[PDB]
Structures are given as C-alpha cells and as structure tokens.
C-alpha cells in the first residue's frame, strides 16, 4: 500500500487513486447539467443558498469561453475557474493563428490534454471538477463532459454532481421520447425541471436556478444567459412539474 499517497502512481490494479479521490470532490459538489438540442446546447446548474445574506443572481457559476462556448462544472469551484482561464487562452491562440473561432471538438481536446497533464506528475494535483461544456460551430451543436482523469466524450445529455443519478435518469427519458430531437426553448424548460428534480438530493437548503444556452436560431450561435421572463417561464414550468 501507499499507492494512493502520490499522484501519477499506478496501483497494482493499474489505477490512479489520486484521480479517483478527485472524483469524490466532484460527487460532493452541486448538480450541473447539459442538454444538446436541435441547433445548440443548454447548460443549467444548482446554486445552494447557504444564507439569506447571499445576493440573488450575483454569484454567477456558468462561464463563457470565447463568444460561442459555455462552461459549467461541479466540485471545487476555483479548479473550474482555473480550467476555464486556460480554455480561454487556448481559444485565443487558436483564433489568433487560424482566424476562425475554435471548434468545439478541438476545444474539448485542449481542455482534455491539459487536465490529463495533471495526472502525469506527483508535483501537481488532479482537477477536482467535472466540466460540462459545449456550443455551436461550423459543423453544428456539440455537448461534452470532462472528468478529472482528462477523459471526455460527446453527449446527448450530461449531468454531474451530487444529484447526477436523478438527473441522468431524467435525461435518458428525453433521449427516448424525442428521437427526432428537442428544440432550444424546450431544452431550457426541461433543464429547469431536471435541476429542480435533482434538488431532492440537496433538499436541506433551498437553491437558486441558473441557466444559459447557445442556439443557432435563438442566440445566433452565441452564448447567452437565460434572464427575466424566459427564466421565470422556465421556473414556473419546473415548479408545476414537481407538484
């Protein structure tokens, strides 16, 4: 034993226990989801209201990369911010050299290689976040989810955090009941519902809903936050479904 004390060490299984321990930090975090729709993607996150003293709608969790990519994560919030800062540098250098905005699969690998690099040495700690991200590019809509190991895949729907099982079950129903696809405005409504349903795992404290979206028709392929009437409409739809 002692294989779990240092990062980048293979156990006799062939496992990197330090990465597996980073996953535990992710599982401890709040629920965040992603939904791939017809011409774009929708991101939503659970924000736990620890106290009345928290200013509503101010502590924003979802982050934009470039102008077409949205990023959300669960786990250690600072680690996610560090990863997004790198993502922004990667996207800037891509656009600087190649002119065109970074494609989503290209962007996914940039984050993937960076996270994977933090499993290669004992002088660094793995990332304590699972990041759900995506957007619209020349080839259409893309949704990704990236783990502490550096492992990522493309997704129809994605979920992580403490209420991931509940969320995953809900996402699986949407995939089955909508093979032809889901619209952007529908996805926002469904995203709100899933976060509310996933809140049963964090039912002690009340929460605040935060949604964003990229859509070719609704937002011209740019990342925008869901605000005002459209946000309230999604909350009302979500509250109606739980009752």
């Amino acid at each position: 034993t002692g294989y779990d004390l240092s990062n980048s060490v293979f156990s006799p299984d062939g496992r990197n226990f330090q990465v597996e321990y980073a996953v535990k930090a992710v599982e401890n975090g709040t629920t965040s989801i992603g939904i791939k729709c017809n011409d774009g993607v929708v991101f939503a996150v659970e924000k736990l209201i620890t106290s009345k003293l928290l200013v509503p709608q101010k502590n924003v969790k979802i982050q934009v990369v470039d102008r077409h990519i949205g990023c959300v994560y669960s786990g250690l919030i600072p680690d996610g911010r560090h990863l997004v800062n790198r993502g922004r540098e990667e996207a800037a250098s891509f656009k600087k050299l190649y002119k065109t905005p970074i494609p989503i699969p290209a962007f996914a690998d940039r984050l993937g290689q960076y996270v994977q690099a933090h499993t290669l040495y004992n002088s660094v700690r793995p990332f304590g976040v699972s990041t759900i991200f995506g957007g619209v590019d020349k080839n259409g809509a893309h949704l990704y989810m990236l783990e502490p190991s550096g492992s990522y895949w493309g997704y129809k729907g994605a979920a992580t955090g403490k209420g991931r099982q509940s969320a995953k079950a809900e996402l699986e129903k949407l995939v089955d009941h909508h093979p032809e696809g889901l619209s952007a405005r529908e996805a926002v409504k469904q995203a709100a519902k899933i976060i509310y349903l996933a809140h049963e795992d964090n039912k002690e404290k009340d929460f605040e809903l935060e949604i964003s979206w990229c859509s070719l028709s609704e937002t011209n392929g740019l990342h925008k936050f869901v605000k005002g009437d459209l946000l309230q409409e999604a909350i009302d739809f979500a509250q109606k479904e739980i009752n």
Binding site: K58, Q63, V64, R88
Partner: protein
C-alpha cells in the same frame, strides 16, 4: 523600426451638440499606386465607439484584432457587459494609447495615426488622437495626415472653441465633414472618391454609413485654362 507599405490617408472628425462624427476614405495605397479600393478604415467597437485609423494597413488589421479581442475579454465573467460594465470610448483609447507608447519605446512602432470617436455613459462626447509616437491630444476637431492641414481649418470655422459645440447641430456638422472629404479628394494625391462616415449620437446611437461618394464637384472652369502663361490656343 520599419517602413509603412500599404497605407491609408486622412481620418477626419469633429464634435457636435449631441455627439461626434468621424470619416475616412476606403483606399489602401501602395506608394503612388492606388492598390486597394475597398478598405474599411473606420472600425466600430460596441454601439458607442468608432476607431478611425490611418497609416500602415497591416498594423491597422493588427489593431482591429486587438479591439475585437478586447470586446471578447471584457465579456468574460461580466454579467453587465452589455450595460454598466460595457467598454467605454475612454477605456478603448487609453488601451490603444498604452500600446502605441509601449511599441514606440521598444523602437518597433505601430505605424499609425488613430482617432477614437465616441460617446461616454454620461452622454459626454469623446474625441481623442493617438499616433505611432504615443503622442495624444484632444480637440473639438481632429484630423490625421493631410486632413490636419486641410480639413481642420474648415471644421474649425464651424466649431472654433468648446462653446461652439452646443450651437452645432448634426446636419451642420455632417455637412462640414462631407465638404472636407471633397476638398481632400481635390488636393490629396493619395485619396479616393469613395469613403465611409460614422455618427455616434447620445440619443440615436451609432449610425454607420458605407459606400459614400464625393459629389457636387467643380471642374467646369478647367476648360478655360490653357497653357501655362502665354499660350492662347
């Protein structure tokens, strides 16, 4: 140190009662060769600022990319990016002025003369100049290159000092700018007939006019001019 290759000529501008006007022709010259006839030298930043650039075009395109990147960067982690924490003309100018002076200090300048025209949050008119040396100044009228010598005299007859700004309407100001552009076409050998004009008003916002032409030109008197002194035929 370098030399400018593909170049843009005058950028002219002035303040009026509710905002600012800025203009520049659509030419990219290659020495005496009038090489490129479709070059846009007025670059808007948001809905409250227009940056007019003269001089080296390769450096202009670099500056254009910096401003484009500046908007992207300002939007990061900024819920008020399209409101209270939007980019101001003063912010955009000071950034450029910092870069210009830094580059001249490394003996590797951006070979340009720049005028940042816009309207601030409080409605105040913004108009300031910066160039390859990092020299900056503000005035009710500003012009680069040949515009400094020919446009300013005409524009200063409309707004001669600060107190003339509230007395100057947008129609009078635009008329003066358009006339100045005609005069430059008469007299600047590296100018073109085609130009762009931009108005930034505190009420009506940003109006960007493309594909304008110099018109109402006086040439008829040329027929009476014969020889260089004694020749009659």
């Amino acid at each position: 140190t370098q030399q400018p290759i593909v170049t843009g000529t005058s950028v002219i501008s002035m303040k009026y009662d509710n905002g600012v006007i800025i203009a520049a022709d659509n030419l990219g010259s290659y020495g005496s060769l009038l090489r490129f006839n479709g070059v846009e030298r007025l670059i808007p930043v948001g809905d409250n600022t227009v940056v007019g650039i003269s001089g080296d075009i390769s450096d202009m395109q670099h500056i254009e990319r910096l401003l484009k990147d500046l908007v992207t960067e300002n939007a990061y982690d900024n819920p008020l990016a399209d409101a209270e924490e939007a980019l101001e003309p003063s912010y955009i100018f000071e950034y450029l002025a910092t870069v210009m002076y830094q580059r001249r200090s490394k003996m590797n300048p951006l070979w340009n003369a720049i005028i940042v025209a816009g309207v601030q949050s409080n409605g105040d008119q913004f108009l300031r100049y910066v160039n390859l040396l990092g020299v900056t100044y503000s005035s009710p009228t500003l012009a680069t290159g040949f515009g400094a010598h020919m446009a300013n005299p005409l524009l200063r007859k409309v707004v001669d000092r600060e107190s003339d700004i509230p007395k100057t309407t947008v129609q009078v100001a635009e008329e003066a700018i358009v006339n100045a552009m005609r005069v430059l076409y008469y007299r600047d050998a590296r100018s073109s007939r085609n130009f762009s004009l931009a108005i930034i008003d505190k009420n009506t916002g940003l109006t960007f006019k493309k594909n304008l032409q110099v018109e109402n030109m006086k040439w008829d008197f040329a027929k009476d001019i014969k020889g260089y002194g004694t020749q009659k035929i």
